[PDB]
Chain A
Amino acid sequence: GIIGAGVDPLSYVPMVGVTGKGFKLINKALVVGAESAALNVASEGLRTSVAGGDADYAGAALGGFVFGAGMSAISDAVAAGL
């Protein structure tokens, strides 16, 4: 629950330590039919050929999610400022 939860985060710790790591956003809720397995031998997860491919993505996401939720909160704040 990064949004749905959901926080700002506009007042948050400088967040130095975090890199990735154990960030997979299985929002509880917003999951509907949860077919555990697979559709084919494709699918799977990020189909990538570099090591770090599941952590570069994760990093991006933490950095994308935090920034997106923050832009949402700051646009709600400037809304009230207007």
Chain B
Amino acid sequence: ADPQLIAALYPDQAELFLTMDMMDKQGIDPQVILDADRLTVKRSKEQRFEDDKAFESALNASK
């Protein structure tokens, strides 16, 4: 009923809202998310720095 509001009040589990809205509104199976979220590597504190810098480049260079 109000996607934005429930999300706004709890600014913590936006991950769950994204996954659920993937699950129901879009047509993807709630099986193909399961593996990819179970198969993930631990980001291991190394490639993240590269990941923070990453959020910063596609953001600025987006236009």
Chain A residues with CB under 8 Å of chain B are 11, 13-14
Contact = CB atoms under 8 A, between A and B. Distances in A.
A13 B61 CA distance: 6
Contacts, number: 5
Interface residues of B, number: 3
B49 to A, nearest CB: 18
Where chain A touches its partner, the secondary structure class is loop
Contacts of A13: 60-61, 63
5 contacts: A11-B63, A13-B60, A13-B61, A13-B63, A14-B60
Contacts of A14: 60
Contacts of B60: 13-14
B58 to A, nearest CB: 11
